[PDB]
Amino acid sequence: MTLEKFVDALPIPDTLKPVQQSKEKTYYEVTMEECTHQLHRDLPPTRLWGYNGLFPGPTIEVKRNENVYVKWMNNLPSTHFLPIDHTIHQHEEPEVKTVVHLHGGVTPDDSDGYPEAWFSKDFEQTGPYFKREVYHYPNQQRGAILWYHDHAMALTRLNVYAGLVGAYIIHDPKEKRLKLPSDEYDVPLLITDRTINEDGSLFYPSAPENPSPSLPNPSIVPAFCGETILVNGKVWPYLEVEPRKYRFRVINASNTRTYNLSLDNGGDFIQIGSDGGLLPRSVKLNSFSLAPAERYDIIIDFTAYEGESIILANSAGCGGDVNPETDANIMQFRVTKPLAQKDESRKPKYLASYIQNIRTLKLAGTQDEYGRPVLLLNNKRWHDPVTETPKVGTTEIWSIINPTRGTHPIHLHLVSFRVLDRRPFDIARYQESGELSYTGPAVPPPPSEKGWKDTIQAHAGEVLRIAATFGPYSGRYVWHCHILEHEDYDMMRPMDITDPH
């Protein structure tokens, strides 16, 4: 028997309060705490690692150009409760390393959360790139859905699965005149798949299928597909909504899983924004794909559906087809709250208006000495000399070629980018020869991808082209696959945005 669906109200994480706020600076403190929270009516409390002891973390709301500082502290225990594989990466390091990355942040390099800028409990020990306790987020960027999460070297999949995710919204007051649904009718949805034991403890696997005798125990796995789906820290919740327009900030905070969402009454979503902010023009959607770290700013118009119960449904597989009783379900909207006031919100169609190098990038896997797949960007390891070195201020086109069997959601820190096109190629030939020979025309982005993206699905047997301008800041960043199981082994590379000064 699987946990009974739709019997816990969707929590709405509280908005973090500043420690200090003047007209020209905002200081926040966030402490990583081991904590316990009940993930379903019928479970005992689950041991979790959460920002301020909460899962998800507090929702952080800033205005565009708000000068924000965050002191992210580690008060976690010194050993992990999830299985650590020592083989993937005065010389014995602490087992628990944390660093916070603001995903989608236009962030100076020393506050971006470099994987090797980790710290242990109370900053007692720190990685090689550690420089500062208090991170600076000048927020000089378009309003959008951001999120924040752990990024420590070789531990990212574990620390995130343990609960260290939160939302961060940048409000651009020049967008207020669109009258998009707001306040109580603006709601974040952080989607996390989890596998939960009978006693409420989290399960994370300590070995993959691969039965080979040489396998380190524990071993990293190439993918994690959870049995149960959570939204805002509750398993298959319901939200009571009013019969009107709502805004939802949908964030995929899962380790590996891709969702493909729809509404079981047949209703439509209106996509208004992507990772990088508002789309140039809205889009009526009946379904959409959402890979790890992707965000979809959307409206749902519950006006025509008073009294109905509507399932937010999932059709994407993860390690097999979806099971209709379990991972085919996300959550349930109940249109049964009395309209508290007239629906003065709007759903405009029109929302906004917007080549020094080419770089070719290969996504491929090799095999380690134990027979495990190691996933790699351009056949380089994390610790190899940096090769992606655009000059600050310059625009490049990245051609990302994927001959592997699966989609990889590729994310670049600091920037958002334009999607140019995707084009299919003959893997067979490309494999055998190195020859990039196409099989059909180039496909331009749908409307969903006509704005700005920071995390982008590079599909099997396609070459993906995107255009990024590498600024405004310079320095040491990263880019990587955002399936955390891939990132940690070893599909992540440093990215130097070079500065003549």
Stretch that binds Cl ion, among 4-12, 190-198, 282-290, 351-359 (CB under 5 A): 282-290
> How far is it between the farthest Cα atoms of the chain?
66
Would you say 406 or 424 has its CB closer to Cl ion? 406
Q: Which does 486 bind (CB under 5 to 8 A by kind): Cl ion, Cu ion, none?
A: Cu ion
Does residue 407 touch Cl ion according to CB under 5 A? no
Q: Which does 67 bind (CB under 5 to 8 A by kind): Cu ion, Cl ion, none?
A: none
Segment 72 to 91, residues that bind Cl ion, using CB under 5 A = none
Q: Does the annotation flag 101 for ligand binding?
A: yes
Q: Which does 260 bind (CB under 5 to 8 A by kind): Cu ion, Cl ion, none?
A: Cl ion
Would you say 383 or 459 has its CB closer to Cl ion? 459
What residues line the site for Cu ion (CB under 5 A)?
A: 103, 293, 408, 413, 481, 483, 486
CB < 8 Å & 24+ apart, contacts of 177-181: 178/346, 178/348, 178/351, 179/344, 179/345, 179/346, 179/348, 180/247, 180/272, 180/299, 180/345, 180/346, 180/347, 180/348, 181/244, 181/245, 181/246, 181/247, 181/299, 181/345
Segment 285 to 304, residues that bind Cl ion, using CB under 5 A = 289
Q: Which does 408 bind (CB under 5 to 8 A by kind): Cu ion, Cl ion, none?
A: Cu ion
Nearest approach in angstroms of CB 493 to Cu ion is 11
Would you say 252 or 282 has its CB closer to Cu ion? 252
Nearest to 223 by CA among 48, 408, 364: 408
Q: Which does 257 bind (CB under 5 to 8 A by kind): Cu ion, Cl ion, none?
A: none
Would you say 142 or 413 has its CB closer to Cu ion? 413
Would you say 8 or 294 has its CB closer to Cl ion? 294
Nearest approach in angstroms of CB 179 to Cl ion is 7
Q: Which does 289 bind (CB under 5 to 8 A by kind): Cl ion, Cu ion, none?
A: Cl ion
Specify the amino acid at residue 312: L
Residue that has been written with the tokens 């998009």 in this structure: 180
Would you say 150 or 301 has its CB closer to Cu ion? 150
Q: Does the annotation flag 35 for ligand binding?
A: no
Contact mark string toward Cl ion, 304..333, x via CB under 5 A? ------------x-----------------
CB atoms within 10 A of CB 335: 20
Nearest approach in angstroms of CB 146 to Cu ion is 9
The pairing of strands 277-285 and 245-252 is: unpaired
Nearest approach in angstroms of CB 480 to Cu ion is 5
Q: Which does 413 bind (CB under 5 to 8 A by kind): Cl ion, Cu ion, none?
A: Cu ion
Nearest approach in angstroms of CB 376 to Cu ion is 10
Nearest approach in angstroms of CB 288 to Cl ion is 8
Q: What span, in angstroms and rounded, lies between the C-alpha atoms of 174 and 246?
A: 20
Q: What span, in angstroms and rounded, lies between the C-alpha atoms of 216 and 293?
A: 29
Q: What span, in angstroms and rounded, lies between the C-alpha atoms of 67 and 412?
A: 23
Nearest approach in angstroms of CB 139 to Cu ion is 15
Q: Does the annotation flag 491 for ligand binding?
A: yes
Nearest approach in angstroms of CB 254 to Cu ion is 11
- Nearby residues of 233 by Cβ (< 8 Å), 6 or more positions away: 11, 37, 39, 55, 56, 190, 192
What is the per-residue burial (b if ≥16 Cβ within 10 Å, else e) of 435-448?
eeeeeeeeeebeeb
Nearest to 19 by CA among 34, 30, 32: 30
Strand, helix or coil at 184?
helix
Token pair of 52 as six digits: 């301020």
Nearest approach in angstroms of CB 459 to Cu ion is 12
Segment 161 to 190, residues that bind Cl ion, using CB under 5 A = 181-182, 185
Does residue 260 touch Cl ion according to CB under 5 A? yes
Nearest to 353 by CA among 454, 448, 451: 451
Nearest approach in angstroms of CB 25 to Cu ion is 24
Q: What span, in angstroms and rounded, lies between the C-alpha atoms of 353 and 142?
A: 12
CB atoms within 10 A of CB 227: 15
Q: Which does 316 bind (CB under 5 to 8 A by kind): Cl ion, Cu ion, none?
A: Cl ion
Strand, helix or coil at 351?
coil
Does residue 269 touch Cl ion according to CB under 5 A? no
Q: Which does 182 bind (CB under 5 to 8 A by kind): Cu ion, Cl ion, none?
A: Cl ion
Q: How many residues bind Cl ion (CB under 5 A)?
A: 7
What is the per-residue burial (b if ≥16 Cβ within 10 Å, else e) of 156-169?
bbbbbbbbbbbbbb
Q: Which does 245 bind (CB under 5 to 8 A by kind): Cu ion, Cl ion, none?
A: none
Token pair of 353 as six digits: 């208006």
**C-beta of residue 159 within 8 angstroms of C-beta of residue 145:** no
Which residue ranges make up the site for Cl ion (CB under 5 A)? 181-182, 185, 260, 289, 316, 345
Pick out the residues of the known binding site for Cu cation: 101, 103, 149, 151, 408, 411, 413, 480-482, 486, 491
Pick out the residues of the known binding site: 101, 103, 149, 151, 408, 411, 413, 480-482, 486, 491
